[PDB]
Amino acid sequence: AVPLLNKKVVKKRVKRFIRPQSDRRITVKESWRRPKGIDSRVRRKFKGCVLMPNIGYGSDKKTRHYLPNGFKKFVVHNASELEILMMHNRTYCAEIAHNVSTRKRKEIVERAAQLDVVITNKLARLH
Amino acid sequence: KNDQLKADAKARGEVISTKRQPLGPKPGFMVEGATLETVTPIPYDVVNDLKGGY
Amino acid sequence: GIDLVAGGKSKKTKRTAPKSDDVYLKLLVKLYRFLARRTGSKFNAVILKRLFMSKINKPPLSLSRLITYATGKGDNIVVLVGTVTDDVRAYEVPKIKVCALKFTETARARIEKAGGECLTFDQL
Amino acid sequence: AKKTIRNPELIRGVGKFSRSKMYHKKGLWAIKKKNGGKLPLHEKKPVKPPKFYPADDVKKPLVNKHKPKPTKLRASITPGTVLIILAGRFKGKRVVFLKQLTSGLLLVTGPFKLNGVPLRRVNQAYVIGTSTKVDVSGVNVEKIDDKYFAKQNVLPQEKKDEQKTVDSALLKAIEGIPELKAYLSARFSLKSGMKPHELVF
Amino acid sequence: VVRPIKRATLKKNPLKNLNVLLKLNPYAKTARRMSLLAEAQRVKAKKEKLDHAITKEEASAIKGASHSWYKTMISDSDYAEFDNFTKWLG
Amino acid sequence: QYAKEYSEQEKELIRLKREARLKGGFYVDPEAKLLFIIRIRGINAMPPQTKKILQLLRLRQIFNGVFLKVNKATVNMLHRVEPYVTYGYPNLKSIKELIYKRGYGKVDKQRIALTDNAVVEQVLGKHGIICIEDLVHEIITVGPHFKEANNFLWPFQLKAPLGGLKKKRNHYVEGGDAGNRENFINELIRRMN
RNA sequence: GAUGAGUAGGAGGGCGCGGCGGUCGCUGCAAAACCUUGGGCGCGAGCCUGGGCGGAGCGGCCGUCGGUGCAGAUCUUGGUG
RNA sequence: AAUUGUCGGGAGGGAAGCGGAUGGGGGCCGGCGAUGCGCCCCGGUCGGUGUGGAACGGCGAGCCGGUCCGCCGAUCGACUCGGGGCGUGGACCAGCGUGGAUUGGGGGGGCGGCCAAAGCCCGGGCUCUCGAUACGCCCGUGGAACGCCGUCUCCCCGAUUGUGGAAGGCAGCGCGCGCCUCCGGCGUGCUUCGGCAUCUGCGCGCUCCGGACGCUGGCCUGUGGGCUCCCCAUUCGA
Ligand SMILES: [K+]
Ligand SMILES: [K+]
Ligand SMILES: [K+]
Ligand SMILES: [K+]
Ligand SMILES: [K+]
Ligand SMILES: [K+]
Ligand SMILES: [K+]
Ligand SMILES: [Mg+2]
Ligand SMILES: [Mg+2]
Ligand SMILES: [Mg+2]
Ligand SMILES: [Mg+2]
Ligand SMILES: [Mg+2]
Ligand SMILES: [Mg+2]
Ligand SMILES: [Mg+2]
Ligand SMILES: [Mg+2]
Ligand SMILES: [Mg+2]
Ligand SMILES: [Mg+2]
Ligand SMILES: [Mg+2]
Ligand SMILES: [Mg+2]
Ligand SMILES: [Mg+2]
Ligand SMILES: [Mg+2]
Ligand SMILES: [Mg+2]
Ligand SMILES: [Mg+2]
Ligand SMILES: [Mg+2]
Ligand SMILES: [Mg+2]
Ligand SMILES: [Mg+2]
Ligand SMILES: [Mg+2]
Ligand SMILES: [Mg+2]
Ligand SMILES: [Mg+2]
Ligand SMILES: [Mg+2]
Ligand SMILES: [Mg+2]
């Protein structure tokens, strides 16, 4: 399958937004939280501090949610759901759900080859 | 005055405006030459720094 | 920097769509979105806006008041973005063509008995 | 028919004569008489089934009206000019410029006998044109073109003979100028205190 | 009763792009041609060393008037009103 | 026709000045009818009166520029925002460059680039202005329809001056950059357009 | 076409947890949980997936509901420097 | 999970961590990167106008259809069928060319303004000296070059960048549609006598013209390429 997308993917930022002071404290997890403190230097955006996520970082709508291979992911749990991508094989690629058995993955992979549907994790748990 | 000016203009088919206008820029003109009086700064005198002098 | 208020953006709120989930109302909105755009008619634009409005902004119209405003205008079609109710204080009901979102059971019976017609906005 | 352009250009896109002047020169007045006092009116100049239908409509790029123009030749470079190669395996060697090919590249020769540089194509951006000129009037390279340097290792004997034929006519001209043979046999290099932006070539 | 069924142009600098300027001001071409032709004549005239628009009497009057005006421009005050500083002012 | 008129006015002024010189008198040039105003200070710490006047002049951003007709009403407004602006008398060259390079028309309260004469005609057509040359002529001569023609022009978004400013905090007379600089506004228009 | 600061505060659109009414699925050919210098998506809350461990359950979607989201409270209980 | 031992990698001149930017060393990734397509004949395989049936349909009794089976005629076509020949070529990176937009820098030319520059040079008249061999004043429609300011215009170099994917539109021209000796010449109207959108329509083309195209090379299981992952170093911030 030849991906239909042609515009290059431009990531405004590739680093993640780490919660402030999650390095200092084990109990403070890395998932982002907006600092609400009155004196918070991060909230006040002093230079040399952690950056906060804002809408300006939004990616181009034409390349948003596109994988590096040039397709968009759709999660499939069986062979029937795979057939939904027959007419979108140049736009959407399939990914087999993490909990599908190896026996049922062989059926999905074989069916995807007939439909020319890209499978992102076709080598999963077959050894 | 505005009513009559518009009436006098309506009969002759000439659309005009009766609005007042603020003072605009003056046009160019020639001024006849005359004797020129030269103005220069005055030398300072401390005695004159008082109404009527010291 | 730019010396504007709220970055030059509007701070006014108006209804751009009905708040209701009524499937029939949404079909009427689609019908009159098309009519307003493709005709430029002021009547269609007004009708479209009133279909968005809340219940209190679509008050009912009594049949008696409908008759008084329709006196001497039999040929014209009465249009109401709202409900038409029956009025026991009105005795003589002339034949009239009325378009409304809803007719009460008594109001519909009296209008139909008098030879009139109750229309919907798709028939209008 | 007309032998020369009616309206020479003062600058690119502006003719020397106005519309009123051009009407006289175009002769439309004469044409009007021959056609009953009217300018003649002309008329405008008057499959296999697919084997596969794509699911997504194909998009064709919009029209671009800009057309590439031939590569320009630097004013410093004239036939017979000595060039200094600035890059590649022959960096620093002094060669003789013969002509510019249709691709815009420069055709140069060592000559091969003096410095071992054969008939080769060198990009203009990687050479410096000096002020030394060697006569190449007797050199004939009309047979050489872009296709002569196209791939399809032993060098065929045909090209070796072709090098010598072009080379032979050029050696006599080079030998005429004293110390020119040694000049073309030595590579150019920068020594201490040598500033390229001040060097005269 | 329905009415019949119904992208930004990249702005280019007309001060540099000739065709863009002619689209806005067609007379600009005539102005361009005349300026180029006028300059060419002057350049040619200077090389050939090619050789008045005022009467001889008029020229004399103009020189006299300008010379008289210049005299008033450089004229100085007599500094007579400063009686207390006559010596200092010279 | 406009090109011929501009040349005649320039030569007409020269002739009159020479005529007055010959007779020994003076020729007072006509007072400037058109001004070009540029905002040189930012939007921080604005006193309320200055803030309102700059809004009425459509100077809401530093280095924005607009034309302004000369009359006692407008001149007195300008006098009250002297330290925040610099202005002067624009010549024909300045008006051409501004309108041609940075000219945008206000159509239905939208900023539209003057790429074609159709844009000018869409708004000013009823006033007889159908091309950018007509628009230039109306501005330079301050014609009868100056108000509509000038308001049709979106305030010019000029760049920071090439070469910088001297001192925005002082008046041009003191060696600064604020206030009336008369014909020297053109020198600044070159470096900011 | 214009435009983008925000404490107290307001509102919108979304993310996540556990049930219920439905609907579409997964699982001893290995579910949940947990581990990982595997990889990717989203501005972000989060999401998807490889490998490992584990050995019996689980998830998506629509609606609807709630004892539904923690770094602090000399917070509680337990554990540990 | 806190916390601890051990093995392995790494760092450490009175904290460490953290933001941003690269680099070194690791680790990881083949949807990390293609190998097809078009046209030929050799063979193989599989189906083909007009009449018969079977089960149905679109439009609204009647017209208008396809699918499947069979029979004739017609004799071609198809083929993720196998070989051969010819043409063509994918991902990423780099270079170059020609241009658009934005922008910085450099060089030249024309014209105008001034005391219709001043001055200087030439010619003429006056004045006649202490810094001693002057100081300067006035004249000429004399001459050769500058100066400042304004304006018109030509050329050269570098930098960043290609968003859009429906339109050969808009604008300005060229060549034909009439002849000549062809850098140009030949007809009306207007003209400042230089010129002029006054005649300047059609057809086919060109261009600074409704947003970048073209060419070439490198590399493609490698010591390659990529990386948002890991450790560390360095400059800035903190
Ligand atoms: K369920
Ligand atoms: K994981
Ligand atoms: K739920
Ligand atoms: K100049
Ligand atoms: K470029
Ligand atoms: K490669
Ligand atoms: K650092
Ligand atoms: Mg990210
Ligand atoms: Mg505070
Ligand atoms: Mg798993
Ligand atoms: Mg802003
Ligand atoms: Mg605000
Ligand atoms: Mg301040
Ligand atoms: Mg702006
Ligand atoms: Mg600079
Ligand atoms: Mg400064
Ligand atoms: Mg201050
Ligand atoms: Mg905000
Ligand atoms: Mg759940
Ligand atoms: Mg870890
Ligand atoms: Mg979920
Ligand atoms: Mg509960
Ligand atoms: Mg709770
Ligand atoms: Mg806690
Ligand atoms: Mg808290
Ligand atoms: Mg505690
Ligand atoms: Mg405790
Ligand atoms: Mg303890
Ligand atoms: Mg642990
Ligand atoms: Mg001059
Ligand atoms: Mg593009």
Author numbering:
A (entry chain g): 2 to 128
B (entry chain V): 111 to 164
C (entry chain S): 2 to 125
D (entry chain H): 3 to 48, 55 to 160, 181 to 229
E (entry chain F): 306 to 311, 317 to 361, 365 to 403
F (entry chain I): 50 to 242
Authors' description from the paper:
Ribosomes are fundamental to all forms of life on earth. Their activity is regulated via chemical modifications of the four rRNA species: 25S, 18S, 5.8S, and 5S. Here, we report the structure of a plant cytosolic ribosome and a quantitative mass spectrometry analysis of its rRNAs. The overall structure of a plant ribosome is generally conserved relative to its eukaryotic counterparts, including in regions that are responsible for the binding of mRNA and tRNAs.
For zinc finger protein eL34, whose aberrant expression in humans is associated with malignancies (Fan et al., 2017), no density corresponding to the zinc ion is found in the plant ribosome structure, and three of four cysteines that form the binding site are absent. In addition, we found a modification in the remaining cysteine 44, thus eliminating the zinc finger motif. A phylogenetic analysis showed that the structure-derived observation is conserved in Viridiplantae. This suggests a lower effect of zinc deficiency on protein synthesis in plants. Therefore, the zinc finger previously believed to be universal is absent from plant ribosomes, contributing to physiological functioning of plant metabolism at lower nutrient concentrations. For example, 2′-O-methylguanosine 1857 and 2′-O-methylcytidine 1849, together with the conserved modification 2′-O-methyladenosine 827, shape the N-terminal region of eL37 through hydrophobic interactions. This region is involved in constructing the peptide exit tunnel. In a similar way, 2′-O-methyladenosine 886 and conserved 2′-O-methylcytosine 2920 directly interact with the modified residue 3-methylhistidine 246 of uL3 through hydrogen bonding. This modification is crucial for proper pre-rRNA processing, polysome formation, and correct ribosomal function (Malecki et al., 2021). In the large subunit, most human-specific modifications are concentrated at the bottom, in proximity to the two largest ESs—ES3 and ES6.
